[PDB]
From Swiss-Prot, chain A:
Keywords: DNA-directed RNA polymerase, Nucleotidyltransferase, Transcription, Transferase. Belongs to the RNA polymerase subunit omega family. Promotes RNA polymerase assembly. Latches the N- and C-terminal regions of the beta' subunit thereby facilitating its interaction with the beta and alpha subunits. NCBIfam families: rpoZ. Its EC number is 2.7.7.6. The lineage of its organism: Bacteria, Pseudomonadati, Pseudomonadota, Gammaproteobacteria, Enterobacterales. GO terms for molecular function: DNA binding; DNA-directed RNA polymerase activity. The keyword Nucleotidyltransferase applies. This is DNA-directed RNA polymerase subunit omega. The RNAP catalytic core consists of 2 alpha, 1 beta, 1 beta' and 1 omega subunit. When a sigma factor is associated with the core the holoenzyme is formed, which can initiate transcription. It comes from the Bacteria. One of its GO terms (cellular component) is DNA-directed RNA polymerase complex. One of its GO terms (biological process) is DNA-templated transcription.
Swiss-Prot record, chain C:
It comes from Escherichia coli O139:H28 (strain E24377A / ETEC). The lineage of its organism: Bacteria, Pseudomonadati, Pseudomonadota, Gammaproteobacteria, Enterobacterales. DNA-dependent RNA polymerase catalyzes the transcription of DNA into RNA using the four ribonucleoside triphosphates as substrates. The chain holds residues 1244 to 1342 of 1342 of the full protein. Belongs to the RNA polymerase beta chain family. The RNAP catalytic core consists of 2 alpha, 1 beta, 1 beta' and 1 omega subunit. When a sigma factor is associated with the core the holoenzyme is formed, which can initiate transcription. It comes from the Bacteria. This is DNA-directed RNA polymerase subunit beta.
Swiss-Prot record, chain E:
The gene is rpoD. It comes from the Bacteria. It comes from Escherichia coli (strain K12). Contains 4 domains, connected by flexible linkers. In the active conformation, the domains are in an extended conformation, each making extensive interactions with the RNA polymerase catalytic core. In the autoinhibited state, sigma-70 factor domain-1 packs closely together with sigma-70 factor domains-2 and -4, contrary to the extended conformation that is seen when the protein is part of the RNA polymerase holoenzyme. The lineage of its organism: Bacteria, Pseudomonadati, Pseudomonadota, Gammaproteobacteria, Enterobacterales. This is RNA polymerase sigma factor RpoD. It is found in: Cytoplasm. Belongs to the sigma-70 factor family. RpoD/SigA subfamily. The chain holds residues 92 to 167 of 613 of the full protein. Interacts transiently with the RNA polymerase catalytic core formed by RpoA, RpoB, RpoC and RpoZ (2 alpha, 1 beta, 1 beta' and 1 omega subunit) to form the RNA polymerase holoenzyme that can initiate transcription. Identified in a complex containing RpoD, the RNA polymerase subunits RpoA, RpoB and RpoZ, CRP and DNA. Interacts with Rsd; this prevents interaction with the RNA polymerase catalytic core and with promoter DNA, and as a consequence, promotes transcription from promoters that require alternative sigma factors.
From Swiss-Prot, chain F:
Signal peptide: none annotated. Belongs to the sigma-70 factor family. RpoD/SigA subfamily. Transmembrane segments: none annotated. Contains 4 domains, connected by flexible linkers. In the active conformation, the domains are in an extended conformation, each making extensive interactions with the RNA polymerase catalytic core. In the autoinhibited state, sigma-70 factor domain-1 packs closely together with sigma-70 factor domains-2 and -4, contrary to the extended conformation that is seen when the protein is part of the RNA polymerase holoenzyme. Interacts transiently with the RNA polymerase catalytic core formed by RpoA, RpoB, RpoC and RpoZ (2 alpha, 1 beta, 1 beta' and 1 omega subunit) to form the RNA polymerase holoenzyme that can initiate transcription. Identified in a complex containing RpoD, the RNA polymerase subunits RpoA, RpoB and RpoZ, CRP and DNA. Interacts with Rsd; this prevents interaction with the RNA polymerase catalytic core and with promoter DNA, and as a consequence, promotes transcription from promoters that require alternative sigma factors. (Microbial infection) Interacts with Escherichia phage lambda antitermination protein Q. It is found in: Cytoplasm. It comes from Escherichia coli (strain K12). This is RNA polymerase sigma factor RpoD. It comes from the Bacteria.
Length: 89, 49, 99, 1166, 76, 52
């Protein structure tokens, strides 16, 4: 369990945005699109996300970057799919 | 009610505010036990069905 | 007393015990202020929308809770929704602007 | 990009008058009949208050006649009776209307205090009503003949006038007349003419009313509402499901009161149409029209005419206005309260075994609470086939479900709450620990935050459903994350009673005991010495200890030494973490000291070590207090041996003064004062007798004959440590208790001679009873007073939230120690702590900057300022903040549950009000009503008058009611002469110069004055100092900040002096004004900038003004607010807390601040 | 004068009109007779009013209507 | 108004019996998965005939 979030509050200053970011990440884990970045102790996604914040390997910057990259990861897949839609003309 | 042996002394904070720490001797002797009589009702009504 | 999902009041949809299965605790103005003092917006929203007053949000929530997804799709509380009709029932036109 | 048509996520809201065609737009049919249901088959009669055609199908996706019963046929209108088969919920949605035969006035616009139809037409109310009742004729569009436009005539007068002028003259009566008035009204022309008339004549009485009225007019014009709409052509009907006919047990029906009303309206209306088609005489149709007016009025808002009663029941029927308003003063459901799912509650118990980050929860409770989670998790692993079977499993309570519950409980926090919620700590988050029993276990250290005793107090539990709520609870509402009261940086986790008696009993020294004067290597063998029974817990002993100091740079220094201390202190030292010096535990450890221990530990080691430290302190406190064997006997309370003697002597004094009254040496009242004085002095004597005795009387021998120390007596240790009891109560146990006072307040001259250890007889007890009853009554009253105060406070602040980061102003208030009377009622260090310097400060010598510019002053900065002699620091405050529509974090301070600077987006107004309001139960002109008076800015009863302007003054004129005072400035003119009643003893010297704001008389002064004459900083200083004078005298710690934000909200409004944009005398937001003048100093007009004057509005007054009308409808009078907004067509954009709470979306603060921001900028932009 | 509560503003407004004498009733009734019979006679002096009645009775014997929807009966 | 003189009024206690419980609503959604998988079990034409 995570008794105090002070360390996470150290990694990202705002402390509300801590809740938001850790939330978003915890969601990334809870509805599984992804896996933890650090060993799961049986800790629920709620705490795993916080452990990820405390280790400084997860925050708003990192998440935004990863997501932005994944958009192009899908664009690459559907590259030949959507260009086949030239029937639009 | 019922009288009984009482000792005044803090016991491991289990008595903390007004809280009362009672032995098993009491629950075993069934002295503070109470009997409740509840009246439950069943109604047979008339519906258009 | 403990309650998860019970019956609901007809006139305004709100948790109400009909079975001797008790209506949930009442979350008042002061408790709301207590939430406002902290930074918890979502706790408050879920408190007065999905857990109580939203006829949609409650069930749509329940399905997610059992599905293993914790989220909410809040919508508009039925209270305010009724207030709109009561106000509009008078000579007062109340509308919701923009987008 | 096509904007949109259908449903989006809506912003703001709009409110205005309703058009007949608009009313029809909502209406999906006209209700033509008073009938409800068929009386046998309960189906709705077509075209009635309850109807399938107009409103909706009775049962889900089914036609009324029953032809199309299939879920397939949906958008189908049935041929038999048109009913589109759709969900029954639509019968809760679709509205209706009624076409009224004769025109009808809307009672909300007739009877609202500033009658709208009245002042819009510039016509008196009584006239308009006299016209509505057909009591007299009124003119419309008189033209040029003999008569005015708004003029009123009578029967004979109308007849004669008509006989003289057939046409080019017009008069009607009834509702049609008022409608004709409003419709013929041309607002623009009135605007032009009124502007001219405003400009021509010079009189105050004239142009005041003139400008007020033109402003009103043009406002109503810009609204988009046309006056005709004040008169109802069409009457909308509320959906049937919102006024249900739903049946009950025993075949009995129950329906709302709106049906009686609506039915009445329909009836009388139809009967009116009937009487029209029958060509009835005038009198009849007039009576019918009036009756229709009454019915409609009673429907809309009942009680403003006759108070109509419901069928067969005396109690007046509830109208739509009452439906909206609600009850319990002003409570609109999002206020009074709302029932919530996933919750519970029960009696609470102790649970000392708990860590402070957790708490006990009953098994069954947790089962029923987490039930959905339990289902989903049960079938996720595969223990249950389907959700049904899962329910069957948890219903049977199979052995396998308990483990699954242990799974879903683990990292999932729960919210705990108490009944009297005041400060934010009233609700706190904990980690659930499954416990066998029906009782909730609550960690002892938190029992202070809730103000919860163990005497049967109940707590309630809520489950943080959504993920965001889990993380919100864990990172904010969590217990460990708030260790400090938001009011002041002092720890609220301070040990309570048993624990402090434990730590007190531990570290203390009796003169002689086992192992006296020996030496030990370390705390380990000290404890080992104690437990074995070789050494006593309290003995003076030298032992070697290793203490750490982190005084190096981010680094712990280690040093060892032989400390002269006691066995108990040595044992306790094991707990004290790291860099804390041994000195802290080398004392007697009172409640105050044991608190300062935790404090220092937090300001040194940080959060986590403070948490674990506190936990350990609780555990050891309980353990050693248990071992201590502390108890209370009847002999533990020691009465002075000299008591009876003091009693007898003081009793001789009374017969001395009595004999003097017998001989007439003294008067009656003076005698009374004398005897009361001697008895009081007696009580003091016995008190300070028993105190000395009970305190130091222990006389014990070490190696010599005798010596004496502070007593080891139980009740003393209890009172001295601060565990419980106090000199006041101990005084009542041993020595005599006080003198009592009859309800009148006249204090009886025969005090209570006996005490509780002794017996009280009949009289003494009877006399005490009144004191008791007045005690309970007064306290129970002051709870309510506190509540009301907090309410006014949150209402006046609320939406104030930290928004911008830094406004960057050098502005601030001068922070000095309070220095009242004799020495230092409060230091400088506390006043400036956790705040930020407006500008850099100096040493005695300069070009050496200790604290640069704006920096947070923490313990090190404040002690660095304490090292130096600096007596003066200018500090940034929330009252002087340059940021408009909010406070910048750089202005506020660091104060919070955490030592770091205040976060961006935290809502400070709320927490400020809560902080001011929580101690309010502990407050005793002076007192709590004094505080209420202060925040209300009420002018006192017998105030003082400050000098208007500096310079030499003299006494003008003579005696009529006042003797005029003539002021004479040095350079400028001297028109200023104030009329001061001469029957009030003056102060000001007839021959001396008086600075503006000097004392021209005595008594308290209204803060309006202090603001105007002495300045803004001056008045805020007066308020904060006076209210702090009230609290501090009671022993209440409240930081100046909260009071200062309340103050900022008080002065939010100001009245303009100069011009060039808006009106002259308008009171308006200094935010709006300052933003407009700062914008007008450059560009625009080169400089047209207008001067204002800061205004002081009381809290309850400043609460009145809120942009959002939905917010105003909450705590104010709903009926007026809705109208008064609806006329101007006011558009509520939300943006505040209360409004967003009502509408049910994320709060524009806290976590939601990242939302409303990313929105607010998207709005009014690209 | 106006106490509101229309029970009054009615009760008083009607109380103005004085009760009829036993003869005045006959006067008024006579006036009624005069008016009515006037309009009846005016109806009898219209050719289309006659021809219409005829065209209607031609539909009465033709089973397109009934004798009840045309006349309530004659002076018989 | 019922007892206590409070805002408790008769209609406030009238429960909605016309609504459906969520505990059943989750089963109604779950059955649609069950019959779907089970229909995926039979032959395509048996599945067509049964779904029809
Ligand atoms: Mg209590
Ligand atoms: Zn039909
Ligand atoms: Zn500022």
């Amino acid at each position: 369990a995570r008794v105090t979030v002070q360390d996470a509050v150290e990694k990202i200053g705002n402390r509300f945005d801590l809740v938001l970011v850790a939330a978003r990440r915890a969601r990334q884990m809870q509805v599984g699109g992804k896996d933890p970045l650090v060993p799961e102790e049986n800790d629920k996604t709620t705490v795993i996300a916080l452990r990820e914040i405390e280790e400084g390997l997860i925050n708003n910057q990192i998440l935004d970057v990863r997501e932005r990259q994944e958009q192009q990861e899908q664009e690459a897949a559907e590259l030949q799919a959507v260009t086949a839609i030239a029937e639009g003309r | 009610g019922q009288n009984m042996r009482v000792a005044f002394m803090p016991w491991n904070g289990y008595n903390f505010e007004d809280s009362i720490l009672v032995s098993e001797r009491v629950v075993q002797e069934d002295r503070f036990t109470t009997i409740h009589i509840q009246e439950l009702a069943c109604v047979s009504r008339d519906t258009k069905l | 007393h403990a309650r998860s999902t019970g019956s609901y009041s007809l006139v305004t949809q709100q948790p109400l015990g009909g079975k001797a299965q008790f209506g949930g605790q009442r979350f008042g103005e002061m408790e709301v202020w207590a939430l406002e003092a902290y930074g918890a917006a979502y706790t408050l929203q879920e408190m007065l929308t999905v857990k109580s007053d939203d006829v949609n949000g409650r069930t749509k929530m329940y399905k997610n809770i059992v599905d293993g997804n914790h989220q909410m799709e809040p919508g508009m509380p039925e209270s305010f929704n009724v207030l709109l009709k009561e106000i509009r029932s008078l000579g007062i036109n109340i509308e919701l602007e923009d987008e | 990009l096509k904007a949109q048509t259908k449903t989006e996520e809506f912003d703001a809201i709009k409110i205005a008058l309703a058009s007949p065609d608009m009313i029809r737009s909502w209406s999906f049919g006209e209700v033509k009949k008073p009938e409800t249901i068929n009386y046998r088959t309960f189906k709705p009669e077509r075209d009635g208050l309850f109807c399938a055609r107009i409103f909706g199908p009775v049962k889900d996706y089914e036609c009324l006649c029953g032809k199309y019963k299939r879920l397939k046929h949906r958008g189908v209108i049935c041929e038999k009776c048109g009913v589109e088969v759709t969900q029954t919920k639509v019968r809760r949605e679709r509205m209706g209307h009624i076409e009224l035969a004769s025109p009808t006035a809307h009672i909300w616009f007739l009877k609202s205090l500033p009658s709208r139809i009245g002042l819009l037409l510039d016509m008196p109310l009584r006239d308009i009503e006299r016209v509505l009742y057909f009591e007299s004729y009124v003119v419309i569009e008189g033209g040029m003949t003999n008569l005015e436009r708004q003029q009123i005539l009578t029967e004979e007068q109308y007849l004669d006038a008509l006989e003289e002028f057939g046409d080019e003259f017009d008069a009607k009566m009834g509702a049609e007349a008022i409608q004709a008035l409003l419709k013929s009204m041309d607002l623009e022309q009135e605007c032009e003419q009124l502007r001219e008339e405003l400009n021509e004549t010079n009189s105050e009485t004239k142009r005041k009313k003139l400008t007020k009225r033109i402003k009103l007019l043009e406002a109503f014009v810009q609204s988009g509402n046309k006056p005709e709409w004040m008169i109802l052509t069409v009457l909308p009907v509320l959906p049937p499901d919102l006024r249900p006919l739903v049946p009950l047990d025993g075949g009995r029906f129950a329906t709302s009161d709106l049906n009686d009303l609506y039915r009445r309206v329909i009836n009388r209306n139809n009967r009116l149409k009937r009487l029209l088609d029958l060509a009835a005489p005038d009198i009849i149709v007039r009576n019918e029209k009036r009756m229709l007016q009454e019915a409609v009025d009673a429907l809309l808002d009942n009680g403003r005419r006759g108070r109509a009663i419901t069928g067969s029941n005396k109690r007046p029927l509830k109208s739509l206005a009452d439906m909206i308003k609600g009850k319990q003063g002003r409570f609109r459901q999002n206020l009074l309260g709302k029932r919530v799912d996933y919750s519970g509650r029960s009696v609470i118990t102790v649970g000392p075994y708990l860590r402070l980050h957790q708490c006990g929860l009953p098994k069954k409770m947790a089962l029923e609470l987490f039930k959905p989670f339990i289902y989903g998790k049960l079938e996720l692993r595969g223990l249950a086939t389907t959700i049904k079977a899962a329910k069957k499993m948890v219903e049977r309570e199979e052995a396998v479900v308990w483990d699954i519950l242990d799974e879903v409980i683990r990292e999932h926090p729960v919210l705990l709450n108490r009944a009297p919620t005041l400060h934010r700590l009233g609700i706190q988050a904990f980690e659930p620990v499954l416990i066998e029993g029906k009782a909730i276990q609550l960690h002892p250290l938190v029992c202070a935050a809730y103000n919860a005793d163990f005497d049967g107090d109940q707590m309630a539990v809520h489950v943080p459903l959504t993920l965001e709520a889990q993380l919100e609870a864990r990172a904010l509402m969590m217990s460990t994350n708030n260790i400090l009261s938001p009011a002041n940086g002092e720890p609220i986790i301070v040990p309570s009673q048993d624990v402090v008696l434990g730590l007190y009993y531990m570290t203390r020294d009796c003169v002689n005991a086992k192992g006296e004067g020996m030496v030990l290597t370390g705390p380990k063998e000290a404890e080992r010495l104690y437990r074995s029974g070789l050494a006593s817990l309290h003995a003076r002993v030298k032992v070697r200890i290793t203490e750490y100091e982190k005084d190096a740079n981010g680094e712990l220094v280690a040093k060892t030494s032989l400390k002269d201390t006691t066995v108990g202190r040595a044992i306790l030292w094991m707990i004290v973490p790291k860099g804390l010096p041994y000195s802290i535990v080398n004392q007697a450890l009172g409640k105050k000291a044991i608190s300062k221990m935790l404090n220092t530990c937090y300001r040194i080691l940080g959060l986590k070590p403070t948490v674990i430290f506190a936990d350990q302190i609780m555990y050891t406190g309980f353990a050693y207090a248990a071992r201590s064997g502390a108890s209370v006997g009847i002999d533990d309370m020691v009465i002075p041996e000299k008591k009876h003697e003091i009693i007898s002597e003081a009793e001789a004094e009374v017969a001395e003064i009595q004999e003097q009254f017998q001989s007439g040496l003294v008067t009656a009242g003076e005698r009374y004062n004398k005897v009361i004085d001697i008895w009081a002095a007696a009580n003091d004597r016995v008190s300070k007798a028993m105190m000395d005795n009970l305190q130091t009387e222990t006389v014990i021998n070490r190696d010599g004959q005798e010596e004496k120390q502070v007593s080891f007596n139980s009740i003393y240790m209890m009172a001295d440590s601060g565990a419980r009891g106090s000199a006041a109560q101990i005084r009542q146990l041993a020595g005599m208790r006080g003198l009592m006072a009859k309800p009148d307040g006249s204090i009886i001259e025969t005090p209570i001679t006996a005490n509780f250890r002794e017996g009280l007889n009949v009289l003494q007890y009877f006399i005490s009873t009144h004191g008791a009853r007045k005690g309970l009554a007064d306290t129970a009253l002051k709870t309510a007073n506190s509540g009301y105060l907090t309410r006014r406070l949150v209402d006046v602040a609320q939406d104030l939230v930290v928004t911008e980061d830094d406004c960057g102003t050098h502005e601030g208030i001068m922070m000095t120690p309070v220095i009242e009377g004799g020495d230092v009622k409060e230091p400088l260090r506390d006043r400036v702590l956790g705040r930020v310097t407006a500008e850099d400060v100096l040493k005695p010598g300069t070009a050496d900057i200790l604290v640069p510019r704006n920096t947070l002053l923490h313990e090190q900065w404040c002690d660095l300022l304490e090292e130096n002699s600096v007596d003066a620091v200018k500090v940034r405050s929330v009252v002087s903040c340059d940021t408009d529509f909010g406070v910048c974090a750089h202005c506020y301070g660091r104060d919070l549950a955490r030592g770091h600077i205040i976060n961006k987006g935290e809502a400070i107004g709320v927490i400020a009000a809560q902080s001011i309001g929580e101690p309010g139960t502990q407050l005793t002109t002076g007192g709590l009503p004094r505080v209420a008076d202060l925040f209300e800015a009420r002018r006192p009863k017998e105030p003082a008058i400050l000098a208007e302007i500096s310079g030499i003054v003299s006494f003008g004129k003579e005696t009529k009611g006042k003797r005029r005072l003539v002021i004479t400035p040095v350079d400028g003119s001297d028109p200023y002469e104030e009329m001061i009643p001469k029957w009030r003893q003056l102060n000001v010297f007839e021959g001396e110069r008086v600075e503006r704001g000097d004392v021209i008389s005595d008594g308290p002064e209204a803060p309006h004055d202090i603001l105007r004459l002495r300045g803004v900083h001056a008045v805020t200083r007066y308020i904060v100092n006076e209210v702090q004078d009230v609290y501090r005298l009671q022993g209440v710690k409240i930081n100046d900040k909260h009071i200062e934000v309340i103050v900022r909200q008080m002065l939010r409004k100001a009245t303009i002096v100069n011009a060039g944009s808006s009106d002259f005398l308008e009171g308006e937001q200094v935010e709006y004004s300052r933003v407009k003048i700062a914008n007008r100093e450059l560009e625009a007009n080169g400089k047209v900038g207008a001067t204002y004057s800061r205004d002081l509005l009381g809290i309850t007054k400043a609460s009145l003004a809120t942009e959002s009308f939905i917010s105003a409808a909450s705590f104010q009078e709903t009926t007026r607010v809705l109208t008064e907004a609806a006329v101007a067509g006011k558009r509520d954009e939300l943006r505040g807390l209360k409004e967003n709470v009502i509408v049910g979306r994320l709060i524009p603060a806290g976590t939601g601040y990242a939302y409303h921001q990313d929105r607010m900028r998207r709005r009014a932009a690209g | 004068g106006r106490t509101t509560d229309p029970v009054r503003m009615y009760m008083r407004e009607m109380g103005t009109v004085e009760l009829l004498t036993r003869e005045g009733e006959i006067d008024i009734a006579k006036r009624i007779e005069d008016g009515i019979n006037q309009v009846q006679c005016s109806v009898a002096e219209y050719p289309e009013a006659i021809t219409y009645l005829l065209e209607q009775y031609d539909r009465v014997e033709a089973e397109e209507a009934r004798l009840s929807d045309l006349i309530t009966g004659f002076v018989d | 108004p019922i007892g206590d003189d409070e805002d408790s009024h008769l209609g406030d206690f009238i429960e909605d019996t016309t609504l459906e419980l969520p505990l059943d609503s989750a089963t109604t959604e779950s059955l649609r998965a069950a019959t779907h998988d089970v229909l995926a079990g039979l032959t395509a034409r048996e599945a067509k005939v049964l779904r029809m």
